[PDB]
Amino acid sequence: MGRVIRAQRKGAGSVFKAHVKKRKGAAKLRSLDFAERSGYIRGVVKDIIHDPGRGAPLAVVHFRDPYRYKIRKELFIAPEGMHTGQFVYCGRKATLQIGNVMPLSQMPEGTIICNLEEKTGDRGRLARTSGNYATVIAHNQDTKKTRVKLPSGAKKVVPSANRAMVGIVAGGGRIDKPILKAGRAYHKYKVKRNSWPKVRGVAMNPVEHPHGGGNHQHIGKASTVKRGTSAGRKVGLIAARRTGRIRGGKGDS
RNA sequence: AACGUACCUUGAGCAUAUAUGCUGUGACCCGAAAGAUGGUGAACUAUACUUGAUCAGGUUGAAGUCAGGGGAAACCCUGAUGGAAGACCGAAACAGUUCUGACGUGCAAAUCGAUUGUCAGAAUUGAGUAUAGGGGCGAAAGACCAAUCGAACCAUCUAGUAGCUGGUUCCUUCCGAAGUUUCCCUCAGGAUAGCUGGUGCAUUUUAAUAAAUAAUCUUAUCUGGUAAAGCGAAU
């Protein structure tokens, strides 16, 4: 027979969750209440708290409720320059200053942002990670449209009433310091996921991979897998338009 | 009137008892690698997680800092002070290399004794909890999953099948072979005729108180190109 290939085991938890005991409380953007649609609000940052499992720094902040009596604590992603004791603002009437949070219809093109929301209400699921920057380069007053450039480079269209946090987001650049040994990039995957310190194909014994095994060690069967074969055959490099060296430019239009 | 018939041409079957086979299930006997449906265990071990815990003393001096000294500036220059790194030699912790040394019906279903490696981290680990049999897990050997691992482990459908091996039990009397042709995904087996044995049954002036046969020579009659020849015939 054979096995589930090392692709296919990843959905059974017990050596494949994320080790999230020390992660720090489900960071999202603020919700749409009445006030951020109508006016604005003032909140205050009290400490900057680290997120083992990120690279990024968080942002701990609280607010006084327009409806209840208590304080209500939330967790942003860190805009750049965020000193503690900064006075944040969240509103359509809230004027642009880093790092406030304001909807797209009240800032022009040319600004950069972070923590972009696509669907107005779902509080910020776009382009927040370390060392990138949510951008908008297009306004359109016909049916309230604003095109944006994600850090992919592929520029796509979002609605305009959604919210985002103005400015670049803290953390970059943690690709340009080589981790340099097999003890730090143990701990780089101590608490992010549990991948392997990953093990190649061509010396898996060829019943428990596609590729490996043979008299030499060689991929042997060719290495461009289909559109949709039989999850999980797809170990390789899935549906590759190009392959190989790029002797040139690759940015999109 | 031609030809096929398992046909009638004055009927013979059934009812069981017996014996030998051929055939179908346990099919003479025990025997296999495996296929299945269900439950099963992480109490070594792969392995993350949780929470605990421990791992002696020693050499090498990293940035940072410290004045002395030179020079136009940039600042170069010994002296220290400082204790960082997956850094080194080493001990209980662990590992298991070469001796292919000590017992190889042990001390043992893997250990003892000399030797060797790491030893402040990819470290070492007690408990809790996940992961499941064609899958778990694997710093990848098809290792490991309870002395089992190229698929466990435990009861069944399971007396599962075998052209393949082992055994196939009392005495005398009578008779006494095969190893061949064909056919077959056969060439180690089966059917098939062959030989044999049994069962009587019909009958000879060749069977019952020859002028009729069937087998070896003769007599007669056809039948073949092998020796022996034959090149002063063919080929």
Next chain:
RNA sequence: AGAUCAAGGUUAUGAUAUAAAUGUCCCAGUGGGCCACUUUUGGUAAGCAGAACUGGCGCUGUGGGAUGAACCAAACGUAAU
């Protein structure tokens, strides 16, 4: 060619018949063989293979070449000569 009368020696080569004559069970087995003489391919060849015609060995003891399944005598109820 057929039926039916007429004539017809002693039946027509030798030597026998331990008896001849047939229908079932398709009856249990067995479908691997071996050797010598001549006759004989394959090979230089062999205790090899490959055969036609017999006899034997397997089935078989036996007296004889000490010995030896086949060689040569003879094919094995119990007994004396």
Next chain:
RNA sequence: GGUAUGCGUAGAAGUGUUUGGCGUAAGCCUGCAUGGAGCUGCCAUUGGUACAGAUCUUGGUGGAUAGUAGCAAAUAAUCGAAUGAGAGCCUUGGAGGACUGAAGUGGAGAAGGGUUUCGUGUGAACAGUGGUUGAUCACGAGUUAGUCGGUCCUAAGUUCAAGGCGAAAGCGAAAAUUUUCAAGUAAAACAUAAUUU
């Protein structure tokens, strides 16, 4: 099932046998010696019917040896007194030699053991040698809590209300949808108020 007015505690079945005999042979008949309650012959039938064998199953038992193999790692035991039927021990207590060396062969804790801990008494197996003491038996006792601790809290995670699907069992399941699926709160009419997923 029929049968022989069948033998049988005045010895029936098998067991031995240097008593005697019949068959070609398998097998009986017979004498003696155990033995203690049931047995065979003719003729009809018949069942799981006679064994040298199956690397046969089970239970005794050989030679080698029934005394060979070997009980050789951890420095190494010793005279005298007891007592004892009897002592190289262990069983003591008297000396006094050397080990274990405080990352012990030392004192107490965990898992697992389950009566071993203790006195008293002892015969045989038990202690790969003995045995007067033993982790063996015999026979007795022996574990006390408000403070040590389980108990409460919650961790990774068991998926463990009925929204759901499956023929049902049940689900290698971040069950976040499930009138109120609120704990409620000394409370006020007129779902006690903003509150609790």
Next chain:
RNA sequence: GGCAACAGGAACGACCAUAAAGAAGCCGUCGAGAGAUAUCGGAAGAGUUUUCUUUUCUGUUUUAUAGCCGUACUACCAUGGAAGUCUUUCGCAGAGAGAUAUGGUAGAUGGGCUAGAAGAGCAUGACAUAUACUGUUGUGUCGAUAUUUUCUCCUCGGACCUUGAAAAUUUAUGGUGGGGACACGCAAACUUCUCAACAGGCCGUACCAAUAUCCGCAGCUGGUCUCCAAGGUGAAGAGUCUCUAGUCGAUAGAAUAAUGUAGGUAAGGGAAGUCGGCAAAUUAGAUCCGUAACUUCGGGAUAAGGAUUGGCUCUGAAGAUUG
């Protein structure tokens, strides 16, 4: 009450509200302390004696919970206005966002005397009592010196794409209301004060805790979680050796054959031996130099290549308190 930091015997929570604690990983650290020990001296009694030794020994203790003194030690308060910069550690840390100072505040974990302390009890020995659950006498006195052969509070810094759990229970504060609340007093106070009665259920407890109680079919050199942890030499928790505790438990008295089992030396030459320099030998500690090529300029570095190293008798140096 205090200029304050905060102080005091107690003096307004019923809810709502923040804010902490409850809440730590791991590394090296100067400060103190605990006990473990070690030398010095009084004591008390034991050790040995040919010979000598004012000598080698045991033993001197005081628990929790309390009250009072109550500094190590960082951070605060008042003052004050520092450059000729200054203060401070093993470090770098510090300063007109107030440094040195002058005094104070609070944490004392720490100690030290007194409560605990019947010569408490205990212990070291005295004497006397057939002796017995007896009797009674005496002692408990001081300094010092060091250590991670260990724990502790405190202090700062260190690696780090490694940032180091939750929650039961809990304090104080904030808070609108509301309830106390007369001055000739009677008081009262879930009062967070003093103090008296009153119960606190459930079960687990003996022992081994591994060369004889576990699992290894067994009393089997085998794998088993941690805890205490001494004299000497010395780098040291090494390794050799004894005190302290405990063991002789591995079948025995005998006997000098091979071969084997392990620990060895062997005159010459020294790899020829054998698959091969593999078992095995030299080297090994520390100080003093002396260091080659190749380097990514961090090495190679203990390179190699050397010298030196007892015992005994001495001078020279490195400190603290009172100057």
Next chain:
RNA sequence: GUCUAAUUAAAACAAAGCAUUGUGAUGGCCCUAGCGGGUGUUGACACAAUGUGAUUUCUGCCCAGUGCUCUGAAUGUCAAAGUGAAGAAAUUCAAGUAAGCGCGGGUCAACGGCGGGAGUAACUAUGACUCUCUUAAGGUAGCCAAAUGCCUCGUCAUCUAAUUAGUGACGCGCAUGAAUGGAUUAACGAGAUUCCUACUGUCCCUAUCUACUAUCUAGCGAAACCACAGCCAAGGGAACGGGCUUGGAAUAAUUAGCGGGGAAAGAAGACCCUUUUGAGCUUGACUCUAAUCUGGCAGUGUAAGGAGACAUAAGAGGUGUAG
């Protein structure tokens, strides 16, 4: 640093690094019998899937074959439903006709590839060259008898008293080579491959001594194994006896040793052919298979515009001799 736990610890693995590849959430990778889960307390400096391998230094040419996607211009294929025509009807064809494969490009840090022939230089030898053949393009920069050169004990110096080796260099290289990665590489190894330095019973060649055994004695006391079984030659045989025919021969019971013989015993051949035997495994092998892609109906709504005057209210055309 990691693994074969019980014969493989290394040249396999593991990195760090480097170029790629899908995904902007209706998502990609994926468990799923089905409902909902993992990735994800998340979001291109994150996730998923890879080939390699520090770095120092360069990534040689090729899109034919298959793998591969395509903003892909496509009559040549092409399934049901649905729509047409015949037919009394089951049925017969028609018009159709989407995705695939073919068809058109893009790509090798995707698998993998990367030739011979003659001639030719005032000696010879050569081949700077010249011609021709043919391919998707012709092994490029470097290396080498490499761990990879049949011929092999290559050809040449050196190490050596004398070296099939180890170093060097030489290239027609059976079958060297650029991330299936090429060529140099400084620091460490239970890594292999050789010559010195030290060296020693490794040996020339054995010499001896201590530790417990055997051995011998007192207790204790088994196991595999065994046709009965043991004196060899020659001959026969089933062909290298222990008995068989002739010989040689042959005097008990037994200890200490040793392994030449018992074709000694292990384990029902691990190699090997064989079963009309089965398990692993692979795609250019037979048939299917979950996932996936795709067309229709189903569930499934209300209006608009246009593309279809279809059925349909309603209008209008006629010239051959003659008349």
Next chain:
RNA sequence: AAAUGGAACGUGUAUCAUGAUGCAAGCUUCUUGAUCAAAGUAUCACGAGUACUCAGGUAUGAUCCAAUUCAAGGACAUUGCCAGGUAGGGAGUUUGACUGGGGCGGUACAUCUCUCAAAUAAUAACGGAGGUGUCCCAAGGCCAGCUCAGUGCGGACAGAAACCACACAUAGAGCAAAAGGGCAAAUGCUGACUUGAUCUCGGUGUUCAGUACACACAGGGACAGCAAAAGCUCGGCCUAUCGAUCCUUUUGGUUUAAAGAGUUUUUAACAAGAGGUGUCAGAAAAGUUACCAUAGGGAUAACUGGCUUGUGGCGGCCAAGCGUUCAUAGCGACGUCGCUUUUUGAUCCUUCGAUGUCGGCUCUUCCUAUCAUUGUGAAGCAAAAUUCACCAAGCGUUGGAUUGUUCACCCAUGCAAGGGAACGUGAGCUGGGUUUAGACCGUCGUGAGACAGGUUAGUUUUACCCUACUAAUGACAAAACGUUGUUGCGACAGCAUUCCUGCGUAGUACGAGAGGAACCCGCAGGUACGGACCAAUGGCACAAUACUUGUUCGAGCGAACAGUGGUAUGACGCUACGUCCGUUGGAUUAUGCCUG
């Protein structure tokens, strides 16, 4: 699921000549506090108690108006079936056989001839030579005429050249194809004319079980075709030129069945063929396992023995010649014929319910086809040197560089280095290769994966049994006799010493000389083993004793303990590296001579 959307005032802007029109609009941003729990207002309760203690309500504060909780997607996802494609991810499978073992070749798997075949027939192997899966409307059917292979003489252009003529033409040709056979007014050339290459019924021939297919053959009946007739014709002149069910499918009577009865279409059936099974009596069918697990096999190999010897080591013979001459000193070509078993294949006879299979080490042994030593003889043998050849197994046949080796090839000793045996030998080792499990490389296969090609890494096991053998002791009995001495004899079996060296012999003999008798012998010595002893010397240690570290013994003796502390000397022994030793009789091969 908090403020959904319009409308109204609420201020400002612009235009309209104070309005309408549209808009901004209604409110917290300069600064780590913080706000909840109704005040205000209004009118009622407008009170109760009784000015007096104390009373609520609504709405405003805090705008109306309509409901869907909010966006975003919409008749598309999702989901139900069916519609085809991709789909080794995953499941079940098979992957023949024949064969001097297997592959890998091979068709010799059905099928045809010539032999192989021993004169009936029959018949063998992967024996020999081949052949076939076609081809032909004429190459068929049959009457008619007319005879070719060649070769002679010929004939403008005319040879190997054409075409006509004439003779000889026994078939030397033709006949579709291989090979045989037949074949002469045919079975050929040419010509005529036609479809018998037809329908039909059953038997018969060779394949053999006297089956089936197939192919031939003779009929009976028909319908014809040529020829005047008789006749000839049911395909190639005869030995090849080919197939069974299931169906698909025609052609068919103008045929029955559809089970209640019609009619009509469909299928269904019978009968002749064809589509098809070349592995030819008929499965639809690719790989490999160095991870592989089983039934077994000597019916079948690798290893060990065994007969055989193409191979090779191995001699004989006759002499063509060489050897200055001289064939035969030594040689011996061309050809002639013979033994061994070291290999090298052969073969498959034994062991597959296991014979531990390659080297070196240690170690006994035997063997002649003799290297050199003893005794000769030969020569182109002067001598020295060396060659030949007979007899001869007695001691001897080595120390090293690479390799894993036998050989190979070195270096050196040697006055000098020969071959061979039970594959001698793994319960004696070693494990370096080789022939498991790790792992890389080059190519070949698309790959898991092979590679008589290279790397490196890997458990090598039990004896106490019985003979065999070294050493150990020994009994009743037996016997020309006892229990027990001591002292003897040898039948008997083993048998071990060895070869060099120098000096003489002497520069002698000899030789022209050069060179040179290491001649006979005597003397001295030396190698290896062999047997022993220890005085001296080397080793090892009376672990007795002296210097000595660490710790306890209070201090002073010790060697107290560190499983032998380390060191140095060290007597008894035991030992080699040292020592002392190892020999004489009698037959008689090879041979010379003796006499005859």
